Design a binder for this molecule. Sequence first.
Ligand SMILES: Nc1ncnc2c1ncn2[C@@H]1O[C@H](COP(=O)(O)OP(=O)(O)OP(O)(O)=S)[C@@H](O)[C@H]1O
Ligand SMILES: Nc1ncnc2c1ncn2[C@@H]1O[C@H](COP(=O)(O)OP(=O)(O)OP(O)(O)=S)[C@@H](O)[C@H]1O
Ligand SMILES: Nc1ncnc2c1ncn2[C@@H]1O[C@H](COP(=O)(O)OP(=O)(O)OP(O)(O)=S)[C@@H](O)[C@H]1O
Ligand SMILES: Nc1ncnc2c1ncn2[C@@H]1O[C@H](COP(=O)(O)OP(=O)(O)OP(O)(O)=S)[C@@H](O)[C@H]1O
Ligand SMILES: Nc1ncnc2c1ncn2[C@@H]1O[C@H](COP(=O)(O)OP(=O)(O)O)[C@@H](O)[C@H]1O
Ligand SMILES: [Mg+2]
Ligand SMILES: [Mg+2]
Ligand SMILES: [Mg+2]
Ligand SMILES: [Mg+2]
Lengths: 340, 319, 326, 338, 330
Amino acid sequence: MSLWVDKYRPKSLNALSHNEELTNFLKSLSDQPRDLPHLLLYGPNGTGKKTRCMALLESIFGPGVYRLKIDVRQFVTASNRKLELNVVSSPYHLEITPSDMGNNDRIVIQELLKEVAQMRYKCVIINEANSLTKDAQAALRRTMEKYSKNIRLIMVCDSMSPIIAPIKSRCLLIRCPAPSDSEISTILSDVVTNERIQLETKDILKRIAQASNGNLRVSLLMLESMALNNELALKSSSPIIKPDWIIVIHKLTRKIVKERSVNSLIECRAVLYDLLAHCIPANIILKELTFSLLDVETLNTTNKSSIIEYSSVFDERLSLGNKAIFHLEGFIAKVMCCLD
Amino acid sequence: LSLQLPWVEKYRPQVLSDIVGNKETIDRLQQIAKDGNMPHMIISGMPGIGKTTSVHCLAHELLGRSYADGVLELNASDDRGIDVVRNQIKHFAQKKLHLPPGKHKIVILDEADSMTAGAQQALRRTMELYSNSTRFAFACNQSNKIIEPLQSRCAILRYSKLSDEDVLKRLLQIIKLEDVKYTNDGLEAIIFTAEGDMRQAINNLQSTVAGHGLVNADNVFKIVDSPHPLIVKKMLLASNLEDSIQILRTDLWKKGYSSIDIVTTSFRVTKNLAQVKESVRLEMIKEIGLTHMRILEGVGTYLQLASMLAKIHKLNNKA
Amino acid sequence: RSKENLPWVEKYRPETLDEVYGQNEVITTVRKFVDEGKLPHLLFYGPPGTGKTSTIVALAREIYGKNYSNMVLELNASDDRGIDVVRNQIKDFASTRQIFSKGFKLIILDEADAMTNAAQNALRRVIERYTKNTRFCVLANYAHKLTPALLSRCTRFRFQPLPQEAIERRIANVLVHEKLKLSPNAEKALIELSNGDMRRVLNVLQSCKATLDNPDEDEISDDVIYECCGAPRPSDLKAVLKSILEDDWGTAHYTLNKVRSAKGLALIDLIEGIVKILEDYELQNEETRVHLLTKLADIEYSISKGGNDQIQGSAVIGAIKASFEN
Amino acid sequence: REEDKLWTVKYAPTNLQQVCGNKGSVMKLKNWLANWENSKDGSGVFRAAMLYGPPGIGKTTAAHLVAQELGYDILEKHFVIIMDEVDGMSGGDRGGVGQLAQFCRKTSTPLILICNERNLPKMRPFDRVCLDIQFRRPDANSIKSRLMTIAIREKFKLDPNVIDRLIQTTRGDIRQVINLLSTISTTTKTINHENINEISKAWEKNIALKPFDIAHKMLDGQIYSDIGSRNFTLNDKIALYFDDFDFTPLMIQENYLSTRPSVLKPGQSHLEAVAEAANCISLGDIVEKKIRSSEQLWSLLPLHAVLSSVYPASKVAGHMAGRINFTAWLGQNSKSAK
Amino acid sequence: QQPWVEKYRPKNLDEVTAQDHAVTVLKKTLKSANLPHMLFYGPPGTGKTSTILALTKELYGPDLMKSRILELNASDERGISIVREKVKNFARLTVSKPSKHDLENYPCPPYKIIILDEADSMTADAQSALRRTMETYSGVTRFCLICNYVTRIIDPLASRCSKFRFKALDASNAIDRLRFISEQENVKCDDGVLERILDISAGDLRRGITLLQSASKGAQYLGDGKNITSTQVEELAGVVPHDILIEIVEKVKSGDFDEIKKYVNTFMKSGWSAASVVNQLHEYYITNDNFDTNFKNQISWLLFTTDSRLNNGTNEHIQLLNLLVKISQL
DNA sequence: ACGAGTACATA
DNA sequence: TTTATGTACTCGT
Ligand SMILES: Nc1ncnc2c1ncn2[C@@H]1O[C@H](COP(=O)(O)OP(=O)(O)OP(O)(O)=S)[C@@H](O)[C@H]1O
Ligand SMILES: Nc1ncnc2c1ncn2[C@@H]1O[C@H](COP(=O)(O)OP(=O)(O)OP(O)(O)=S)[C@@H](O)[C@H]1O
Ligand SMILES: Nc1ncnc2c1ncn2[C@@H]1O[C@H](COP(=O)(O)OP(=O)(O)OP(O)(O)=S)[C@@H](O)[C@H]1O
Ligand SMILES: Nc1ncnc2c1ncn2[C@@H]1O[C@H](COP(=O)(O)OP(=O)(O)OP(O)(O)=S)[C@@H](O)[C@H]1O
Ligand SMILES: Nc1ncnc2c1ncn2[C@@H]1O[C@H](COP(=O)(O)OP(=O)(O)O)[C@@H](O)[C@H]1O
Ligand SMILES: [Mg+2]
Ligand SMILES: [Mg+2]
Ligand SMILES: [Mg+2]
Ligand SMILES: [Mg+2]
C-alpha cells in the first residue's frame, strides 16, 4: 500500500542486509528442511522477527507464501459467550495471532490445532507469544510434543520471562539482535535513494536513526512523516517530531518533578485514564515512564535507586494483575513520595 | 441391625417447656399458641438453637388435632422452585377445611433462606392474599440473604447463641433420662466442645456414653478435641515465636488438620480479633491472605505457616 | 486373578475392622456403636489416606449381610452430589423402607467437601427428616469447605495421623505375606518419609521389592529406600548444612554441586530437609528465625514457579549465610 | 372472625385522612386522580404515576383509599387496578418491561404502581414517561398519634418519647412497627424506656446501601478511630463490603485520596499516607485476579475487602471535600470498547 | 529423516539410561502384574513421557495398547463434567479380550493403563473425581499422573500414586547418552564440548539435543570439516562472551549511574536474554574469591530477587538495570 | 421428560 | 467487562 513499511520489506534472504550471522543461520536451517525443529525468535521490537520467519518460510516452502488471504472463524467458550478472532489463510502455511482476549485464548488455539492437524509439515507462527496467560503455552507444550511430524511450531515473542520453562525447553533459541546506528543509517539512506529526498547533511540521518533506539518500524514511520511534512526535503534544520505518547509522558514527568501535591496526582491519574483509553499495554508505559524519570539531571543516585526499585516492584505487581490503573497509581505515589 | 432411635429424636421436644434457650421468645410462642392468632414470623440464627423444633412444637400446640392436613410441612429436602412451591402453597390455601375459630393453619418452610428472588415475590403475594385463612412460618439459617420486605411483612424473632445454663440443664435432663454417671469436669468439657451448639453437645454426650460411659474430659477430647477458633486464638496471640511454632505444630500439624483449614481459621480469627490494634489487624489479615494465596496456588507446606507466624511476630515486635 | 494382580494400596484393603491400626480410639468407639446398637450420623475427619473409607466399608460389612452391594448406595464426587440428583435419588432411597427384616439404612458420603452450599442445605434436611431408619456417614478432608450445620448434625470423628506403630505393623504384615526382609535403617527411613500416609509407605515398599533383581533371600537397606523414593540422605543433608555454615562460598558451592550431581538430588527436597533440621539446633537470637522462615518460603515459592536450579541453590546458600551472620 | 385478623389488617386506615406521613404525596395523588378526567402542574396528563419508597408504609393502602373515596373499582363507572410489587419482576419479563411501559403510556384507567426502594437497573422503560411520586421515611407525629390510638384500643401503654427510637430502629416501617408492637404486647403489654435497648438490638432492620452510599460510610474518619472501632467493628466492615462487592473496590479507589486524612500518624503526610495505601490496592489486584481465574478460588472473597476497600480507606480517612466520586475505570472501558 | 527431538525417542526401557531407579521397577514389573499407580514428577525433559510411552509399548504390544490405553492431556478438556462422562465410562467397562498373538510375544497384564499428562494445570474438581476414580475400579484399570510440578498435585493424589522422582540430568549423569548420540550421528567434537553443553542446559537433555542438532546443521552447512569448539556452542546457546561480562562488571564497580544506564540500554539492544545474564553473573561472582562474604550473600539475594521477579512476566531491561544499579551501590 | 438459551450468585 | 461450575428458570418440541 501507500505505507512505507510494506514496500521496503525484504522479498527473500538475498535482501536480508541486517545480520550476516543470522542470515547464515537461516540458510543452515534451510539446508535440511526435514530436520527443522521448533523455532523461537527473540529480540527487541522492530528487529524484524516476523520478517525473518517469513523469509524462512520462503526458504523452506518456496512459492505461494506471499499470497495469503484472511478468514474469520467463530469460537465457543464457557457459558454462552461467543468470541471472534481473525486468522490469515494461505494454501500451504497457517498462522494465528493471540490478539484476542488472553483468558480463553487457549481453547481457540486448541481447536485450530486439532482442526488443521487431522492429517510436508505445516508450519504455524504465533507472533507476540508473550501475551499467553500460561494456558495456551500449557496446550502447546503437549500439542507440539505429540505432533512433531505434521505441524512445526514457530514462536515469535520477546522477553521470554513470562513464557514458561518447558516451552523454551522444546524450542530453539535464535537471536534477532537490534542493529547498530550504522546499519539503520544505511537502510535509511537506501530508502531515501529509492525515493527522491533532498538530503542536505548526513547528520540528520544519524539523528533520525538514533531517535528510534534500535527500532526499525518507528524509524521508518517517522522518516515517512518527515518526508510528508518537510516536502521530501531532509534539511539539516528539520524539526524532529515524536509520537504524542512520549510527549505526554514527558509532560507528566515534568509535572511530577516540578511539584509534589494532590492536584498533580489527580491530573496524572486523569492522564493515566486517557492513556489506558488510548488502547495501549501498560508495561511499555511503565518502562518508558521510568526512562523519562531517569533522564532528569536533578535526580540523585539514592533517589534514582529508590525509583528503579519501586519500578521493579510495581512491574511484578502489574504482571501479577489485570487492573493496570492500581499499579501505575501506586508507582506514581511512590515516586512522588521519594521526590518529596 | 436393630438400632435404637438416635438421641436427637429421643430428645426432640413436643412441648414449649422442654425447649431451652431464651425465655422471652419461648414464652411469646406459648402465649401465642394459647391465643391462637399466631402472626407470620421469620426465624434465623446459627444452627442448632431451636429454629425448627420450636416451630414444630408451636404448630403442635396450635393444631394437634389436624396435624396431618392442616400443617403443610414444606421441607428443603423436597423440590423447591418459583412455581412448584407456589402451586403447593395455593393448593394448601384454597382448601376450605373448617378450622376452629381460634385456630389457623401453619405453613412451614424449613431452611427457606436459599430460595430465589421470584419465589419470595410470589410468596409475599400469596401471604398477603391468604393471611386470614393460613399463616406462614420460617426457620431459615441467616436472615441477611432474605429480602427486607418479607421481613417487614412478618414478625422478626431472632434467637441468640445458647448459654451454658440452658445447655447444662438439658444435658442433666438427658443424664437423668438415661441414668448415666457423669462428672462436672466432663460436663464442662462437653459444654466447651459444644461451641454453643447444643446438638453437637448431645452428639458428644452420646459418643462419650457409648465409648466409655463415664463423662471425662480426656475421652471427650479423644473423640471431639478442642475447637479450632480458640486454639488459633492462642497461637496468634503468643508473644514468643518458637513457642508459637511448637504450639501450632503440636495442636494442628500433628493432629491431622489441613493447612488451608488452618489458614482460613487464622483469617477468621484475625477478622474477629479485638485485643490488638485495627491497623495491625489489617496487616495481619493481608499477610494471612498472602499465605492463603500461596497455599491455594498449590504450595501446601508447614513452612508457609512458619513464615506466616514469622511475619506475625515481625509485626508484633514492630520489625 | 484377584490377589497378586493389584497395587499394595488396594491389594491389602482392610475388609474387616480388625485390620485397621493406629485408630484404636475410634475403632473401639465404632465397635461399641455396632455392639450396643446406637449408631448416629457419622462424620470422619483426618489426613488423606488415613483409613476413612476402608473403616466405613468394614463397618458396613460387619453390620449388614451379603446384600450390602445392591442395597447400600454410596455417592462420591465422581458420582456427583448435585442438589437435583440428591433430591431425586437420596430422598427417594431414604423414604422407601423395606417392610420386613430391617433395622436401619446406611448412606455414606465420601469427599463431601466438594459440593455446593445449596447441596449441603439439601443434605442436612434429608439427614434430619429420615433419620428414624437411615443413617448418614460423611467423609471429608477440609472442614472449612462444608456448612457448619452439616458438621453439627453429624458426629465429628477426627483420625489422628498414623504413628510409627501402625506403619511398622503394616510393614511386618506385608513382609510376612509377600516373603520380604527389611533392615532397621530402611524402616527408620520409611518412618521418616511416611508423612502419616499408609499409601505412600506401601508404594515405596513395592518400589523397593521391584528394585531388587531377586526379591527372595534379599534385604532392603536405607540406601535402597533413598534411591527409590528420590529422597536425600541425612548424611548428605548434614554435610551440606556444615559446608554452608562453615566453609566459604566457593568450596560450599562446589560441595553442594557435587552432592546434587552424585545421585541426582533435588534442590527442593534438600530445602525441606534442611529446614526441618534447622529447628533441631537452638538459635540465640529471634529475628534470624523470621529471616530464615520468610527466605525459605520465598525460595520454595520460586522453585514452585521454576527457574534455573543453580540460581535458587545459590539463593539457599545466601539465605543460610546471611541468616546466621549476626 | 373475632381475634383472627392481624393487627395490620384490623387497624388498616379505613379513611384516606387516617393515613400517617407523606401528606404532600397524598395531596399530589388526590390531585392526580382528580385531574385525570380533565385531560396546571402538568401531572394531569403526565399520568401513570407510581408510589415508590420505603416498604410497608401504606403506598398500596393510600392508593386503595384514594381509589375508594373517588368511587373507583378496587382491583389488584370508574375502575382502577392497584398493581403492587413492580420489582416483583426481579430483572425478569425479558422485554416485558417495555410492555408495561406501553401499558403505562396507553390505558383507559389510572394505573397505579407500587414498589419498594428501587435498586433494579430496569429504570429505562419508566425513566421519564411516568410521574415519580416519591415516598420517603415518614415523620413521628401522625404515626405517633396512630400508635397512641392503637394502644388505647388494645389496652396497653407506651412512652411517647421512645416511639422515636422504635421508628428509627425500623427506619420508618409502619407495618413493621405494628407487628413489633403486637409481638411485644402478646407478652409485655407495657412499653417503657428500660427495654428499648434490647427491643432495638433484637429488631434491627439491616438494609443494603446503593454503591454510592457505602463509599460515604466507608470513607469516614470516625469509624477508624478508637471511639468508632467498637461502634463499627471489623466484622461489620467486611460484611458491609459484601453488600455491593461487585462495585465496592472500584468506588473506594476513586475517592480515598480525595479526602483529608483525619487519622494521620504524627510524622505522616498526605502524600506518604496515600502512597502507603495506593500500593495496597495492587495487593488486592493480585487477589481479585486469583479469585476469579480458572482456579475459581471464591473462598478468598473476604480477604479482598481488606486489601482493596478497608486498608486503603483506613490509612487515609476523614470528611470528604466534595460529593462521592463515582468510579472512572468503568467509564474508561466504554471509551475503549468503541 | 526426522528431527532428533523425536526421532531418537527411547523406544525401550533399557534405552533410557537415566533415572534407573524408576526404570528397574518397571523392568521387574513387566514379569509380574502388581504395578501400582505411579506419579512421574521432576524437571522437564527428563523423559517421563518417553518412559511411559516405552512402558506402554512394551506392556501391551502394538495393538492392545491401542485397544486399552486412554490418554488425556491439557489439549483436551479436563473439567469435572468431562472426567465424569469419560473416565468413569472407560473405567467401568471391562478390559478387551487379548488376541492370540499377544499371549506369546508380550507379557500383557489383564488390566489397562490410563495416563493423565500435564495434571499440574488442572482443577481441584477433577482431583475430587480422581481420588475415588482411582480407588473404585483399581482392579480393572491403572492411572498415571505426569506433571513437572508435583506441588500442584495435592497430598491425596500424590499419596495415592507412587512418587517416582526423576533425577535431574546433571553434567555427570547424561554424558553417555549424548555422547552415544554424537557418534551415532557422526559429528566431530572436542574433549570439553559435551561437558559444556550439559552445564549450559539446566537438566534438559532435549535442549542439549536441540543445541547438538543446530551445531551439526551449522557444521554441515559450512562444510569446512572442523570440530565443534566451545565458542561455537556458547554462541548457539546465547551465552554472553566473557569480555563483555568483564567490561560490564568493571563498569558496575565504577559507579557512573548514567554510564551504567546507557550501557545497559546498549546491552539489551544487543538482544541477549536476561536469564543467561543472571546465570553468567552468578557463575562469575560466586567462583571469584575477591569479594568478601557479605557482598557474596547480598549479590546472591539480588540475583534471586531478579530471577524470581523475571519468571513472573515483567520486563527484562528494568529488572537487569535495577539489579546492576543495586549491586553497584553495595 | 429433556435439550438449549438465558441471567444470576460465588459469605 | 471479569469466569468455570452449579443452580434455577421457562418456554418449546
Ligand atoms: N432450644 C432447643 N431446646 C431443645 N432441644 C433443642 C433445641 N434446639 C435444638 N434442639 C435439639 O436439636 C435437634 C433438632 O435441632 P434443630 O431444631 O434442627 O436445630 P435448629 O436450631 O432448628 O437449626 P436448624 O434450622 O435445624 S439448621 C433435636 O434433637 C432437638 O431436641
Ligand atoms: N489404620 C490403618 N491400618 C492399615 N492400613 C491402613 C490404615 N489406614 C489406611 N490404611 C491403608 O490405606 C489404604 C488406602 O486408604 P483408604 O482407606 O482407601 O482411603 P482413606 O484412608 O479413607 O483416605 P482417602 O479418603 O481415600 S484420601 C488402604 O488400602 C489401607 O491399606
Ligand atoms: N399510615 C399508616 N397508618 C397505619 N397503618 C398503616 C399505615 N401505612 C401502612 N399501614 C399498615 O401497614 C400495611 C402495609 O400495607 P401496604 O400498603 O400493602 O404496604 P406497602 O407500603 O404497599 O409496602 P409493600 O408493597 O407491602 S412491601 C397496611 O395494610 C396497614 O395495615
Ligand atoms: N533418560 C533419557 N535418555 C535418553 N533420552 C532422553 C532421556 N530423557 C529425555 N530424553 C530425550 O528427551 C526428549 C523428550 O523427552 P520427554 O519424554 O518429552 O521429556 P519430558 O519429561 O516429557 O519433558 P516434558 O514433557 O516437558 S515434562 C527426547 O528426545 C528423548 O530422547
Ligand atoms: N534485512 C532487512 N532489510 C530490509 N528491511 C528490513 C530488514 N529487516 C527488517 N526490515 C524492515 O522491518 C520491517 C518489518 O519489521 P517487523 O517484522 O514488523 O519487526 P517486528 O517483527 O520486530 O515487529 C519491514 O518493513 C522491513 O522493511
Ligand atoms: Mg432446622
Ligand atoms: Mg477415601
Ligand atoms: Mg404492594
Ligand atoms: Mg512430555
